[PDB]
Ligand binder design. Sequence first.
Ligand SMILES: CC[C@@H]1c2c(C#N)ncn2-c2cnc(Nc3ccc(C(=O)NC4CCN(C)CC4)cc3OC)nc2N1C1CCCC1
Ligand SMILES: [Zn+2]
Length: 294
Amino acid sequence: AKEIPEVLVDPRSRRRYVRGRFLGKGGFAKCFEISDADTKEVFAGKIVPKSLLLKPHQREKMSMEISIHRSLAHQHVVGFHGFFEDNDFVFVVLELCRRRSLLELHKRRKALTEPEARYYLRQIVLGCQYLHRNRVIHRDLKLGNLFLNEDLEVKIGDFGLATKVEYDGERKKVLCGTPNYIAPEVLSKKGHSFEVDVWSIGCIMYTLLVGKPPFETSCLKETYLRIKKNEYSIPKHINPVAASLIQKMLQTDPTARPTINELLNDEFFTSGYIPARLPITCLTIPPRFSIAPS
Ligand SMILES: CC[C@@H]1c2c(C#N)ncn2-c2cnc(Nc3ccc(C(=O)NC4CCN(C)CC4)cc3OC)nc2N1C1CCCC1
Ligand SMILES: [Zn+2]
């Protein structure tokens, strides 16, 4: 069966992590709360058996994932703390985001209030500005990959579909993986780059405000059909300034979308209330954002 060790020891760094609470699957990975022996500091551990990494291509992807992620550090990106291996497993030590992800928020709250959406989107955007500035395209921005720490700060994670732009104007021809909010240029196999992430952020904005994803259907291929056609619609109860921004991000032509750097200067942000922080009640109850308590 090949057992996962109770203690994970990085022979090089000489750190030892005690394996704790199981967190769930993450593709080939089993994930656990792991804690450092000396410092007692608690991380999220991504354990993937080498028995599922028999093929060089599968190994290369993981190798690249780490390559990309180890080089990144930002307030709104999941902290990369390390990786190591024994002959049976690959262990990746990541920032523990104790509030899980926006997917879990979405499932509890469905559509958010506008200022919550503004709050989360700004952090999503700041993180992605950072990525793009460092030539990295995430290519699978979704709610499940947008983790939340104890202070409800967004942390972009899971760089398994990410890719590094190596030269100016490079159109990536391939994307091994199936992103959730997949851009039409990927689906048509026309070649793609950074605008893929702005697409996804468009879908995320929609989802956060509407309470459901823009192109959802019962068949994944019928959904891809709709993306190709740009066949979505924004409910009337959505404000036009928000709606306008969604429309700019969800255009079939990638060159018509705003760049990541344009986004925070949109009316949606600059003329609406953006909370400095959200209370933990926001996991469960919609916030009214009152001006003074009782
Ligand atoms: C490390 C991989 C990935 C992750 C990546 C990646 N890739 N980057 C950061 N992270 C994560 C950071 N933080 C977390 N935090 C927590 C996730 C889940 C729970 C939880 O309560 N799970 C119950 C679910 C119901 N079940 C019945 C019992 C267990 C608690 C958490 O924090 C206290 N998770 C990250 N993930 C997740 C992706 C899915 C599996 C781990
Ligand atoms: Zn492939």
